[PDB]
Design a protein around this ligand. Sequence first.
Ligand SMILES: Nc1cc(C(=O)O)ccc1CN1CCC[C@H](O[C@H](CO)c2cc(Cl)cc(Cl)c2)[C@@H]1c1ccccc1
Length: 467
Amino acid sequence: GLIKHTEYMEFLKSVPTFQSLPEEILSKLADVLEETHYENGEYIIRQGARGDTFFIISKGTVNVTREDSPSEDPVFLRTLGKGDWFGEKALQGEDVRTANVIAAEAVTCLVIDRDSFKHLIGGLDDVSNKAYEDAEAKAKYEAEAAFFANLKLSDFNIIDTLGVGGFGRVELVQLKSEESKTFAMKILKKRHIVDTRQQEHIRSEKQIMQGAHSDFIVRLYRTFKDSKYLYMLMEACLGGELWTILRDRGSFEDSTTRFYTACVVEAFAYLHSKGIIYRDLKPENLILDHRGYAKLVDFGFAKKIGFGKKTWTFCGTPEYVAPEIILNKGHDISADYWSLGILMYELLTGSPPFSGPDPMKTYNIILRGIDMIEFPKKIAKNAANLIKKLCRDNPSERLGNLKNGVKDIQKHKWFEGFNWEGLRKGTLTPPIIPSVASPTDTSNFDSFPEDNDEPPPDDNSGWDIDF
Ligand SMILES: Nc1cc(C(=O)O)ccc1CN1CCC[C@H](O[C@H](CO)c2cc(Cl)cc(Cl)c2)[C@@H]1c1ccccc1
């Protein structure tokens, strides 16, 4: 019906999830959705029954209940109303109903069975599948956040240590209910953060790392907190630290360094797309997963900046600080292209190019520039040429900040023959293949002694409110 199709259309444009979708999808949905009516107390879905239908509530309210066992009272889960929906798993295949949906008053639902939804999905356009992916990604992450929001620290067990410092430590943890699932738990002493004045640094680290979805960045699922520590639940990358592998090997070959530099270029293309400066690039910030792919791990100095704006915080290890940071001229994402040049040089030779006996002396040699360095014979011509373009003194003139952004780095002669697409798909063979026997294998990390020392003092000031 023309009227009914427009009423369905105007109703679908009022639902927060469906309104982003194109007109083709919303119109084709309106062409096949059908109305079903219920009354107060009537069961729409019964737990344990089989089903092949998804419901969108267009009028009234429903009570969602469930029983954990046959000899137990039903536990009330939630109440849903106009614009909400339920029964979606019946579209994806699984028929058994895991909860009752009972009408709280007179209800109308717009329904679409499994076969109709499948037939609608089966024949669609190429543009029609692109905004569908954005909405599927958005709801796939909100569902991930909800899975982790249910968990507590008491649901995990410590396996072994991955790293130790003044900050605290990084532990390989296993989820008690699923032994195939292991994570890297970074446990920070709140006292060390307060003594170093990193309250806002750790606060933006949580915001950046959780919102980031890149295969070249370590995921941060959630955080926890208690009176002494902050806990950051991350993706376990069991291939090992790039700094220990670099230490063990001395330096990396040209092709080896190229694959790791390419991993950082992808991570930076993603961060720079969101207006985020990384600022902490060095071999210690890279970790290999079980395949040998490299990912950025630490977002302590990272910062969300506005398009066309600069920042002025003097931060970082002196050898990796860009000249505009030393000179207090303000900096943006182009300080990461400088860092990329420093990383290439250290990975190819075992040492970064600029280093004095203290910070001030290191800053003095940086201000002298990359054209004042005698490049080792070890560094290939194309690699030396790319380093000099990445480490141009003026950030405006720096490669990656020119006409085509990061594409100017990707198109450089050093990367000729490099399969960027194969790297993004995960089919490019990495240069060092780590040996990982299981999710609990920590043999690619150094051994750490257990911490026998006293716990740090309690910190009950509410700067950690969001953790
Ligand atoms: N939450 C979540 C978790 C996961 C995961 O766990 O991986 C995956 C997906 C989602 C998002 N998903 C949830 C259910 C409702 C909707 O999806 C159904 C098809 O199931 C649907 C019904 C109609 Cl009538 C019309 C359209 Cl366009 C879609 C929505 C969705 C929203 C937009 C696009 C696709 C799906």
